[PDB]
Amino acid sequence: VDDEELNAHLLNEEASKLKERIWIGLNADFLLEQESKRLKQEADIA
Amino acid sequence: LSDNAKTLHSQMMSKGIGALFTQQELQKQMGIGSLTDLMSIVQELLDKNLIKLVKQNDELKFQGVLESEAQKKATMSAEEALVYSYIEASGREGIWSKTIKARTNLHQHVVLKCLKSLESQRYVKSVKSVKFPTRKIYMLYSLQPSVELDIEFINSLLTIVWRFISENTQEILEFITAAQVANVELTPSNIRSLCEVLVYDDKLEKVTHDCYRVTLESILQMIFNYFKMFPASKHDKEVVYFDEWT
């Protein structure tokens, strides 16, 4: 059930690091997730 | 103005935190001004909430604290930092949550909503204390559980020390170091406590105020012979009971 346009459905390879810089420029949810995940280990010895 | 306050706190942080300072040496140390304007910058330094006023009994006493904890408590609001002062005043033995409510007049909801935020600020932990179980005890991260261990598995320590005396208090202390025993701190007082449980069971005997001899329970271990005494207990109405007289 192949085709040609969904076969072309794939990223812009030179606009990858263009796009994730925008995606990382909007995101902070995993940021505070990280030091809370780092807090899961800190409360183990506390 | 500011520079006179910069000199005095450098004198407060000059000495190691002990030897709590007072005024009678402070005017000897910083007496370039009269007492009328010396107090006014210290009350302004109280307005800059660095100096605190500690108490040695029946008299007036001062104590300076570091700038590092002063900045983090300035992030809090009025009531937020106010309750944080009570826990850090306790310090070593914790403090009970209901007693904190008594020293504030803040009722049960507003105190619990404050410290819910305060644990996320990583300044306060909750420990389980044993001299009054199931009470809320708060400390810093400085970890003073001054209040061996209450839960079981003392018998694993206890059953081996009988075997050392079976073949026949200072002689125990070298033996307990080896054999990968799961211990962290022993003391000659603990072995004295560990031995007298066996005295109450008559597993061995106390002679000459520190020596110990075995009461020959080994032949009982393997009328005063309670082992191998199995009863009939079925289809026999003519048995003897110790109860059923009351």
Curated annotation (Swiss-Prot), chain A:
Subunit (UniProt): TFIIIB comprises the TATA-binding protein (TBP), the B-related factor (BRF) and the B' component (TFC5).
Compartments (UniProt record): Nucleus
Top-level division of the source organism's lineage: Eukaryota
Protein name in UniProt: Transcription factor IIIB 70 kDa subunit
Role noted for this protein: General activator of RNA polymerase III transcription. Interacts with TBP. Binds to Pol III subunit C34 and to the TAU135 component of TFIIIC.
Family stated for the protein in its record: Belongs to the TFIIB family.
Misc. comment: Present with 4330 molecules/cell in log phase SD medium.
Organism of provenance: Saccharomyces cerevisiae (strain ATCC 204508 / S288c)
Segment of the intact protein contained: 465 to 510 of 596
Gene name, Swiss-Prot/TrEMBL: BRF1
Curated annotation (Swiss-Prot), chain B:
Quaternary structure and partners: Component of the RNA polymerase III (Pol III) complex consisting of 17 subunits. Interacts with BRF1/TDS4.
InterPro entries, per the entry: RNA_pol_Rpc34, RNA_pol_Rpc34-like, WH-like_DNA-bd_sf, WH_DNA-bd_sf
Protein name: DNA-directed RNA polymerase III subunit RPC6
Domain of life (superkingdom): Eukaryota
Pfam families: RNA_pol_Rpc34
Subcellular location per the Swiss-Prot or TrEMBL entry: Nucleus
Function: DNA-dependent RNA polymerase catalyzes the transcription of DNA into RNA using the four ribonucleoside triphosphates as substrates. Specific peripheric component of RNA polymerase III which synthesizes small RNAs, such as 5S rRNA and tRNAs. Involved in recruitment of Pol III to the preinitiation complex. Involved in the configuration of an initiation-competent form of RNA polymerase.
Keyword Nucleus appears in the UniProt entry: yes
Family, per entry: Belongs to the eukaryotic RPC34/RPC39 RNA polymerase subunit family.
Gene Ontology terms describing biological process: termination of RNA polymerase III transcription; transcription by RNA polymerase III; transcription initiation at RNA polymerase III promoter; tRNA transcription by RNA polymerase III
Keywords associated with the record: DNA-directed RNA polymerase, Nucleus, Transcription
CC per GO annotation: cytoplasm; mitochondrion; nucleoplasm; nucleus; RNA polymerase III complex
